Amino acid sequence: RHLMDPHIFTSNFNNGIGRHKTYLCYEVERLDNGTSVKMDQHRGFLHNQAKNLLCGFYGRHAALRFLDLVPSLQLDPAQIYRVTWFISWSPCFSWGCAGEVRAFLQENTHVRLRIFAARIYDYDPLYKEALQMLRDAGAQVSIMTYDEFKHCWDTFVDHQGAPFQPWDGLDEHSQALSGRLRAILQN
DNA sequence: TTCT
Ligand SMILES: [Ca+2]
Ligand SMILES: [Cl-]
Ligand SMILES: [Zn+2]
Numbered sequence: 001r002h003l004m005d006p007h008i009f010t011s012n013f014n015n016g017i018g019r020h021k022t023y024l025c026y027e028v029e030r031l032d033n034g035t036s037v038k039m040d041q042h043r044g045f046l047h048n049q050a051k052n053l054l055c056g057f058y059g060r061h062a063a064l065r066f067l068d069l070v071p072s073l074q075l076d077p078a079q080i081y082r083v084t085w086f087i088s089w090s091p092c093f094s095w096g097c098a099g100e101v102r103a104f105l106q107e108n109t110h111v112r113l114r115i116f117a118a119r120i121y122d123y124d125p126l127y128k129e130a131l132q133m134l135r136d137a138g139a140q141v142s143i144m145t146y147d148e149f150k151h152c153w154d155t156f157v158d159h160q161g162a163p164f165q166p167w168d169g170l171d172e173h174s175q176a177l178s179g180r181l182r183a184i185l186q187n
Numbered sequence: 188t189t190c191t
Contacts, residue, residue, distance in 0.1 A: 020190075021191090050190080121189060
């Protein structure tokens with residue numbers, strides 16, 4: 001119920017405009033006797049801790065800051081939950097995050113993970129290996145489409161009554177990215 | 188204007 005600023009959302013989740021930051025919206029649902037129950041109190045968003053060598057802050061990618069906060073969610077380890085991420089950059093490999101998320105999932109088997117990425121972080125030369133590894137660890141790895149952008153707008157942004165207005169090129173970029181990811185996950 |  002801490003809501004994201006409209007301009008922060010549109011300037012970070014635009015799937016044609018890269019930024020030097022990462023934002024991550026998350027939601028948790030519990031699977032019970034077949035159907036799924038939304039746990040609206042476990043909803044939130046965060047961004048990465050920025051690098052700042054000067055001030056001796058080393059910097060922490062958004063995905064690991066989500067892992068940081070899981071204990072506070074107080075999940076029942078006998079139950080099974082689906083955690084959904086809407087992340088403005090896909091997770092990296094070379095800084096260790098994909099592997100850390102895999103280790104978290106192996107240990108925390110009560111969490112299943114669904115990732116929708118706005119953009120592919122191919123700045124990481126080994127970004128393909130992060131995506132395949134997350135898939136191999138049991139996560140759903142997907143590209144955000146209109147439905148997820150609107151859902152994040154409706155759910156996480158302080159819109160004040162304004163309906164989601166898709167930017168130019170939202171569908172074209174989502175489709176192109178969905179094509180690249182599918183090819184990556186075919187292998 | 189790619190977790191600067
Ligand atoms: Ca959805
Ligand atoms: Cl990452
Ligand atoms: Zn990372």
